Every structure is written in structure tokens, then in C-alpha cells.
Amino acid sequence: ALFTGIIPPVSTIFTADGQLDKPGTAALIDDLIKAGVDGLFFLGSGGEFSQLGAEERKAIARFAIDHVDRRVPVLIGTGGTNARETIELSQHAQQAGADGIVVINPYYWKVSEANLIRYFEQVADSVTLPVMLYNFPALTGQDLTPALVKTLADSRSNIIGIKDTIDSVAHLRSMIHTVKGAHPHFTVLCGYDDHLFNTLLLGGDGAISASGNFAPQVSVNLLKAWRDGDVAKAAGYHQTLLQIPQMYQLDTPFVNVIKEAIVLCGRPVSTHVLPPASPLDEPRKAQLKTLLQQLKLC
Amino acid sequence: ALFTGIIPPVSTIFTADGQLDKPGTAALIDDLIKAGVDGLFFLGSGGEFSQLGAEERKAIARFAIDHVDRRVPVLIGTGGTNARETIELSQHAQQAGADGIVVINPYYWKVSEANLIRYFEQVADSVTLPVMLYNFPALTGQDLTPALVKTLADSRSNIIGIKDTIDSVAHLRSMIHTVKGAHPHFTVLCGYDDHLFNTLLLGGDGAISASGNFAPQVSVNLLKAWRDGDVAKAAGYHQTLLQIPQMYQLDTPFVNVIKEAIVLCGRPVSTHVLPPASPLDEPRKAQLKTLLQQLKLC
Amino acid sequence: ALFTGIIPPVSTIFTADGQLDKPGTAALIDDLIKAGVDGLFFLGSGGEFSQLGAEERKAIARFAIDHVDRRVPVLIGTGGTNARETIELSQHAQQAGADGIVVINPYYWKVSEANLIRYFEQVADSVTLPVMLYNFPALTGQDLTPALVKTLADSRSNIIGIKDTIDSVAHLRSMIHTVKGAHPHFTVLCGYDDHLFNTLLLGGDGAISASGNFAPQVSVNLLKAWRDGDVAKAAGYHQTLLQIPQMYQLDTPFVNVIKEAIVLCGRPVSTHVLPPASPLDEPRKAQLKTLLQQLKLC
Amino acid sequence: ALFTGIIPPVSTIFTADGQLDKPGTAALIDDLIKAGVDGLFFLGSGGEFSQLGAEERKAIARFAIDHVDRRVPVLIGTGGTNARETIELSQHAQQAGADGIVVINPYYWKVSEANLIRYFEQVADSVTLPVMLYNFPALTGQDLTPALVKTLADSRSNIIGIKDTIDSVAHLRSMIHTVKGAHPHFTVLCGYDDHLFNTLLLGGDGAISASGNFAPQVSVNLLKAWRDGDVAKAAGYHQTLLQIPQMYQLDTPFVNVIKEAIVLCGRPVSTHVLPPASPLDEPRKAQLKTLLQQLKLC
Secondary structure (H helix, E strand, C coil): CCCCEECCECCCCECCCCCECHHHHHHHHHHHHHHCCCCEEECCCCCCHHHCCHHHHHHHHHHHHHHHCCCCCEEEECCCCCHHHHHHHHHHHHHCCCCEEEEECCCCCCCCHHHHHHHHHHHHHCCCCCEEEEECHHHHCCCCCHHHHHHHHHHCCCEEEEEECCCCHHHHHHHHHHHHHHCCCCEEEECCHHHHHHHHHCCCCEECCCHHHHCHHHHHHHHHHHHCCCHHHHHHHHHHHHHHHHHHHCCCCCHHHHHHHHHHCCCCCCCCCCCCCCCCCHHHHHHHHHHHHHCCCC | CCCCEECCECCCCECCCCCECHHHHHHHHHHHHHHCCCCEEECCCCCCHHHCCHHHHHHHHHHHHHHHCCCCCEEEECCCCCHHHHHHHHHHHHHCCCCEEEEECCCCCCCCHHHHHHHHHHHHHCCCCCEEEEECHHHHCCCCCHHHHHHHHHHCCCEEEEEECCCCHHHHHHHHHHHHHHCCCCEEEECCHHHHHHHHHCCCCEECCCHHHHCHHHHHHHHHHHHCCCHHHHHHHHHHHHHHHHHHHCCCCCHHHHHHHHHHCCCCCCCCCCCCCCCCCHHHHHHHHHHHHHCCCC | CCCCEECCECCCCECCCCCECHHHHHHHHHHHHHHCCCCEEECCCCCCHHHCCHHHHHHHHHHHHHHHCCCCCEEEECCCCCHHHHHHHHHHHHHCCCCEEEEECCCCCCCCHHHHHHHHHHHHHCCCCCEEEEECHHHHCCCCCHHHHHHHHHHCCCEEEEEECCCCHHHHHHHHHHHHHHCCCCEEEECCHHHHHHHHHCCCCEECCCHHHHCHHHHHHHHHHHHCCCHHHHHHHHHHHHHHHHHHHCCCCCHHHHHHHHHHCCCCCCCECCCCCCCCCHHHHHHHHHHHHHCCCC | CCCCEECCECCCCECCCCCECHHHHHHHHHHHHHHCCCCEEECCCCCCHHHCCHHHHHHHHHHHHHHHCCCCCEEEECCCCCHHHHHHHHHHHHHCCCCEEEEECCCCCCCCHHHHHHHHHHHHHCCCCCEEEEECHHHHCCCCCHHHHHHHHHHCCCEEEEEECCCCHHHHHHHHHHHHHHCCCCEEEECCHHHHHHHHHCCCCEECCCHHHHCHHHHHHHHHHHHCCCHHHHHHHHHHHHHHHHHHHCCCCCHHHHHHHHHHCCCCCCCECCCCCCCCCHHHHHHHHHHHHHCCCC
């Protein structure tokens, strides 16, 4: 089973003119590795993959992979709407030394099933890396159903997991039963902080979630506690993760909220975000603060 | 805080010709009281309130109240689309000795907000009983938003709780913060089994959920365990409740599934259901069995 | 082909104390028959069927049928959530002398396909009257798909039409091709005023729509014009019907709006409506007026 | 009033190796200009804008503008998910000699209203060209509401119109009343073929729709007929446009369908499409054929 445990969708730190902030992004990466995370996921939703051009994503992936220097497994998110671009980026990910790619379904056209299976097969056939599907229906307008994920895992041996980004116990549970029942080492990670504990208890594999950026100790210690069999301690950490997603309500996109939380939790990085995200206002920054304080995270 | 803890939406046992089965529905009630539940909810969704005429619901409520004989608090579900009928049934609930009513938003027309607030105020003003709101958007097509529930609790002192029926941690959490933050003794119960533990850990009040019919020990012991501070034991029970809602996938309406589960778990009652529900087929009955067995419930 | 042409969903006139207003409802009926409509539909959505108890609907149907006295075909809307009640009401419609029933899909539980087909078959088998399906997905949360309507017409020879209530050319066109291609004399009526002309031009059969209450001349003359081959004149009337549905935005439910429009267009009836509908306020009454005036309808 | 009448979203012809087909795309353009259209819209949805990288869209826009050589007004679709890319592409559109841009709302993140207004203002401020909004909620997951389109037209003098892509008379009518009532020369075009006639009769301005590629005579003649006051002739053409959108059901994306229809209607171009669209199969190609034949278009 590949890419299990706590794997944060790392934020891409930018300068004020919108270029990659190498020192900042590097410090972030080093904090998270130091925190004990089980991998790193660059150019996810929170990574602002969809506000970036192709060449920029290449640059960011290459840098990110380099700085990690194989200390933990790296995942590059290579998806989008342009299928050829997905292949290009996916192969580049491979050449640049990534351990795997994370591919979302195309999100402008909601593609026929035949075409969706065709698309995921083509991108899977373009690399020899393990490939993680990415479901996020709230944003895509098209759900990767458990049945269809099972069709994809049945078709290609390199389709070996999924980040399931949905506030739904039923989708997580059904994903686990349908897909892991057919493919026991196929990996199921939830996309939201408040579903980690549940995902574990359902027979799933972990979380890729935003709180990994500014508070990875909480998810890392939950996982460690669960693995040591100490469920009580694990549910205690869970109690914090249940509360954390209130902050994501402060803006849309909440990519700015995450960065501001990194700062407030002790890592001073530029919080610049790419449009059409925008700087979080001081009132809401302050409201974010009281929240992090309330939960004993700063 | 009224109507906290484990309060099952009790199944209405029917004869083959569709009349109330007094011996069966009585035995069911007695099992649940014996199991240690904290109240009983008749004529909920699972109670088949919406396949029943007015006079039948009256008869069922009266019988149900009488059999309970004040051993636990009783809630009568009195809602529907016909507002006058809701008042009638709500007052009758009162005369018949109910401890409270449970009122869903009208579910054919999606009511303007002005009318929805007006409707709930008029029903609340028709009784001196405590009143529970009932959110179930999947079926109603209109969500009782935390903000709006807070407007209702602000308006009427007898609107003192909610059964929130949705597979969503965000709605439960937002419901607790918005409404309980403004009204600390306002009751928040979840409508699904897999959300009980989470509901508790979020500062909510319990569950009204189907598994209370055929497996109330699980929810009752979870609650007891959590109240005694033993979180580990409580999460263990939670592990079973995470799995239970698979069975509700076997039919729609799954009212039949619940009854069949009552039987399989040791209480031999007629499983007749009112159309347009229908008898569960033997294959799926058998699939329900293996599931209950897998989970150590029969 | 049964129930073609202009068939209004007639408003049920109530007194200020909420009783059937026999003089008013009778005058309304007589105006419409005099306007040249092709039938009458009582206890539709606009008829307030879902705010009424069973016995009241019987009383209203019986009265309505009796007053019409076979001058035009009468349709009784007998649907709801309670299947047994649907049969009861449907048979009563028959005994009372109705020419057909109009049956919507159950709208609380969104019923499995197997159960939905089973339900419509059972109701169709309970009478010898022609049966009109009623699709209104915005309110039901479950669409009667063309394919499924074709399965129902294929199963029962007395399922002979549909009122399709949806703002969509695609659903209307798809309904016509799938169902009428298989069953040429199967009737397709649209539920909205602005789709009548289109429904005709697509090879459909007419309209059941609210404007038939207060402005049936417009739809009746459109139909007449189209039947005489004078498309220009028919599109002229269409121009008015395109504008009319603005008024339905004034309240929800807009059953009040329709009644107020009946008055303003020259028929002085009580505009009382059953909760949770409410009296339209004077401002909006006035806005309704300017609208009817600007369109040359009062 | 800018960009009124029939303005096709032109297909981008690609070679078999996926490069811009200059001869084919040029012949297409010349057929449409010859057909009497009122403008041309490159890199729309049908233009495959979202399967293309930035540099390719520039190349296509430049070529398209140059070939048109000011014979009709040209619109370049410059939108997407990357805001900076939208500005870049928008300015380039300007330098390259475009008469206007067409900008859709960002369609991955569904952006807060504040950020959406901010985004459209920023892209509008990056050019001096007239700017056409593009609503397509089925694909975007976020509707450009009439109210909001009115807030945008109120804010920026160069936001002067909209292509409204939705199967809904209400949205079109509400768009016209809200926005044109405030801004009489603000242009409202519908995105679907079957809504053109209605859009005209509602006081709107025309259509940008796929049938303009392979059958522009129909829309052009409808417009001409309506403008000459001959409504009958105009509704006749409308009858064909009502039927045409059946073909778009043959695939998703239906970009392939449109190209195949161009061929079948007499213009032999490469029908290659960019993934994740794929070649239409022969059966469906043949079904497309019978359809075009049925309607007297080949």
C-alpha cells in the first residue's frame, strides 16, 4: 500500500510579484518533514495548481522534489482540463524524480464515462509512476464514484489510490468497501481534516488535508496513537481536527486562510496568493487567530 | 436541555392489511426501553409518517404514548405538507400526553423563508409542548440552515432542538456553533448512525437514528461510555455504527430494511410496510443477514 | 389523444375561514369554460392539493365535477405521498364522475425506480380512467425521465399522458421523441406558460399552466391560431406568455399570486389561501397589477 | 449595442497530429462570413479553449483575427482558471487586433462573490476592448445571476454583454429585465440554438450557438426574418433550431459532433479533437447524418 499515513497538500509560497518563494516553501517543507509526516503533495488544490501556468508548475515541482531529496515520498498534482498538458506534466513529474502523481478528473467539461475512463487510462499509461486519483465533486461537478474508481483500479495496476475530498462518511465507506474489498492495497485517503479518524476506523489509509500545513503534529500524532492502539488519545486529537475546518469558511478560495495559519502557528512565510484568490482581511485574520488559540495551536 | 441522549425513531409495526400491530409495536417499544434509550420518537421518517393518513397517525401516537406510560419521554412527529393538519396533529399529540413534537419543514412547495419562519412559529404557538425541528434536505429539497434554525430558536422559547439528518460534519458543527453558542441548552441530535460519536465530540447532544430499532445497545453503550469519560470504548462502538448504514442502501425506502433487521436481531415482528415501500426480496434479506452477522449483532 | 389543448390547473377558492367557496369556485369554472378551454384540472399544485386533507379533496373534486356537468373533460389530481390515499382518492374520482386523474410521483421519499414503476402501475390498475402523470422535479426532487415515462406507457394502456413541469426545452423535446415516437397518441402537456408555443412546435399537445386561471384567452387563442396554421398570430400570443411567469416570483407558494390575478383580471373571488401559503402583501399585489397592465391583461 | 445578431462559437480545426489546421479553420471562417453572420467567436467552449495551453490559444487567436481581416467583428475567449493567464491572453487579444474578449467565471474554485466581482473588474481593467461575460453554470458550478451581471455592468463601462448558456427561459428573461432595464444597450445572447427565437421575443440580442458552424443560414435567416417583421418565417426556422440540440447528446464533449456536422453539411475539414474529447464512432456519425437529413440540412 503506497502513500499511506499523513501526506499534506503543501502550500506553494509565493513572493509579492507571484514567483515561487524558494526559502519560504523550503522552510515549510522542512517543518513538515520534521513533524513526522508520511509524504508530501505539491500542486494540490491548496497548492494553487489551477491558478498556475504549465511552466510554473514544472518549476515548482522540480524545486519541491529537489528540496525534499527523497527524505519522504513526494506526490505531484498534474491534473487539469488540458489532457495533453496532464501527460506532459505527469512525465515531467517522473523525469524530475517524483514518487507519484495525483490526477483529478477534468473539471470544465464533465466528461462522458467512456472518455473519463479513457483519459485516466491514457495518463496512467504515460508514466511508470504510481498514480493517485483525486475526487473533489464540490469543485469538479463530477463525482468519481466508488464503482468507477473500481473500474479504473481494475484496468490499470498503477492506479493504486485516491484522495477523496468530500464531507461524506457514506462516500468514504463505500469507497473503502467497493475498492479496497476488490484491491486490498489500494490506498484511500480523505481530503478533509474532520474525516481522518473515521477514515482510519473504516479501514482506510489516512489523510491529505490542509491542517497538515500549519498543524501536522495533530494528524501525525493521531495516526501514531491509532497505530499504537491507543484509540483514546487518537480520538482526543480527532476532537481538534473536528473543529479546524470552521476557518475554511472565512474565504473562498481558502488557500489564503491556510497560509495565514502557517504564519500564526510560528512559520513566517509570505502569505501572497494567486488571483482570483485575494489577501485575507485583518478582521478575518484576527478571527482566524482566536480560533487557532482556542484550539491550543498557537 | 431536553430530549438528549439516544432517542430512536421507532418503526410502526403493521399487520398484513396495513393496520397498526399493537402487540408487535408494543414489544418493540419495550425492548428499546429495556435497552436503556433516553426517549422514543414515533411517526418519524422511519415510522412511515408520510404514507399514513391523519386519523391513523393519531391512533398510532395515542397507542404509543399510552404503552410507554411515561417510562421515557415520547416525541410525536406531526409534520407534513398540510399546515392545518400539522397543528391538529400537534395539539392532539399534546392532549394524548406526548412530551414533545418533531416538526419537519414542508416538503412539496419549498417555502419562502418568510413563510417558513411563519409556519414554524404558528405550529410552535399551537402547543405548550417543546418542539423539535426536523431537517432532512435530501428528502425535503430545502435545508434548515444553522442561521435559520438560530432565527427560529430566537423567536420561540419552545423551539428547543433539532434532529439534523444529513451526511455532513460541517452542517452538524455549524449547527452546534451557531445555535448552541446562542442557545446553550438547545438540543442537537444527528439523524444518522455514523455521526453520533462526532456529534458528541462536537458538543452536540445525541442521535435519533434507525439502528436504535434493531441495535440500540450500540448507541446506548457509546453514549454511556462517552459520559463515563471512556472515549476508547466509545470509539469502539462508533466503529460498528460507521458500518451499519451500508444496509440502508439495499432499498429505497429502507423502512423495510430496518424492520427486517429488527427480526434478524431477535424480535419477531411483522415486517409489512406501507406503499410505496415494498417487501425486501430474499436475496437482499440474506445480504442484510450476513452484514448484521459480520458486525456481531445477531 | 386524450386531454390535449388548454387545460387549466384551476384554483380552489376558499372563504376567509378556510372552507370551499362554492359560489366563487363555480364562477371561476364558468369563466374558463366560457373562455373556450379544452378541459379543467382540479387539485393540482395551484389547486393547493398538498395543503388539504383527504376528505376535503374528495368534497372539492365532487363539487367541481358536479358543477362542470360534463361541459368539458375534468381531471382530478389525486397524488401525494400516501399511496393508499392515492388509490382511495383515485377511485373516488372515478365514482364521482371524473374523466381522468393526474398523478405526481411521491415526493418525500425519492422512491427506487422499481417502487416508482410499481406505484404508478398500482394506481393505474385501481381505476379504469385515463391517467396523467405529473412531473415537477423542482418540487419532487425526483424527475420522471422520458425513458421511465416510456416504460410506464409501455406497461399500462391507461397511462396516456403527462404534464411536464420544468423550465427546459430539452426535457420537453426528449419527452416528445422518446414517448410519442413509441406512443403517438400519448399526451404531452407542459406545466409552464412560456413553454406552450415551443411544446406545440416540438410535436406536443398543449399546456396545463397557471395563466389559464386569470388569462386563458391568451393560451386558448394561441392554440386556436396554431391549429388554423397562423403561426405569426400564435407567436404574438406567445410573446405575452413569455412574460407572464415573472409574477410567480412574487411569493412561494405563488398560489396566492394566481388568485390575486384572477381578481385583478375581473373575477372577484376570495383570495384566501391555505397555510403555509399566506396572503400576498399590498406592495406585491400592486406590482402584480402593473405587470398585468403592462401586458394588456387588465 | 455591441456584438448583436448571429455570432458563432467557431470550431478550431486541428490536424491529425493535433496542430492548428490553418487551411481548414480558414475555410470554415470564410463559409460563416459568407453565410452572413454578425461576428465570430474563437476559443469558446466549442473552440476547445480548455484543452489548449496558453501559447496555442495565442497562436490560434492571432491567426483567426488575421484571417478575418476585419470583415466581421471578432471575439476571443480568454478565460479559464488562471487569472494572470486571463489578463495575459486578454491583452494579447487586444494587441493582436481583436474587437472584444469573452470571459467565463473561474470554474474550479467557485469563487466568493467579492472575489468574482474583483476578478471580472481586474480583467476588464486590463484591456480597453469590450468584454463579454460568459455564463455556463452546468459546467462552471457557479451561476452569473442577473443581479450580479447588473453589479458588473454598473461597475465597468466595458462590460457590455453576455452569452447566457443555460436551458432556461426564466434566466434569459430575468437577465434581460434586470440588466437591459438598467443598461439598454447591454447585449444578451443565448448560448443554445433552441433559445434564439425566445431570446429575441424577450427583448434580447441574438445567439452564440454551435449550429452556427454547420448551419448558420438557419439562425441568420431567423434573425433576418424577425428583423423584417416576418414572425411566421422566423418561427419556421425556429422549428429547426428546436430540434438541432438532439445531436449534442451523442457525446460529451460534443465538440467532435459539431465538427462532424460541418463535414456532413459540405465543408470537408479534419474533425480531430483534443483530448479528453475523442473521435465520434461511425454508428453515432451515421445517427448524426440521419438527423441532419431529417431536418433538411444536408
